[PDB]
């Protein structure tokens, strides 16, 4: 049939999906005013995307650095951490990833759609978050390897550092699974860790 194949499709599909999910999470958790968001269609369902260049550039730079590590399946978890005014983690949206095309590639599209839908309504299964919140992103690699750090430093003005306990530690976290998908080429789950009392 065809010989033209990207080979790095899965990583790009994941990166693209992660961007949409991050935008949606920021919307439903009200980390930013609904004003900067514009309704859109992704995976054939409605999503909310930011139109703010500063924010968009931050999210894009972040995932671009991640991409290379995804291409080699060195990433165990990608986490969106919602922080309150005191800069303490209050919520964590965890994407636990495991990487074991054509129509089958659209198959994952259908599978990823379930995660988007779950995020859209997670507002219900979670407790309201504090006022002045912001966020950060954490990348848990499968193994502590210098190669991972090498690969991630792909943008001069956007460096990465090793996280600190104060960046990840959350008080009495409660688990809230949202979606688990299983299949060849991609096994992943999304769950939220929520501080017991906000």
């Amino acid at each position: 049939t065809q010989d033209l194949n990207f080979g790095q499709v899965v990583a790009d599909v994941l990166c693209e999906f992660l961007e949409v999910a991050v935008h949606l999470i920021l919307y439903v958790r009200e980390v930013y005013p609904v004003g900067i968001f514009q309704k859109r269609k992704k995976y054939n369902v409605p999503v909310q995307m930011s139109c703010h260049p500063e924010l968009n550039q931050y999210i894009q730079d972040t995932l671009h650095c991640v991409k290379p590590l995804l291409e080699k399946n060195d990433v165990e978890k990608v986490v969106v951490v919602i922080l309150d005014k005191e800069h303490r983690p209050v919520e964590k949206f965890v994407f636990e990833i495991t990487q074991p095309s054509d129509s089958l590639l659209s198959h994952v599209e259908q599978l990823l759609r379930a995660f988007i839908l779950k995020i859209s309504v997670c507002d219900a299964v979670l407790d309201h978050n504090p006022p002045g919140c912001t966020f950060t992103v954490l990348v848990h690699t499968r193994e502590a390897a210098t190669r991972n750090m090498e690969k991630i430093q792909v943008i001069k003005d956007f460096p990465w550092i090793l996280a600190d306990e104060q960046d990840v530690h959350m008080h009495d976290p409660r688990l809230i699974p949202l979606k688990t998908m299983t299949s060849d080429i991609l096994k992943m789950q999304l769950y939220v860790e929520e501080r017991a009392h906000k």
Partner: peptide
């Protein structure tokens, strides 16, 4: 050990900062 955990050095614009509509 948090030896396998990486994060961006830079912080994203705060919701407050965003309040300054520059589009």
């Amino acid at each position: 050990r948090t030896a396998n955990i990486l994060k961006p050095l830079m912080s994203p614009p705060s919701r407050e900062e965003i309040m300054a509509t520059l589009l």
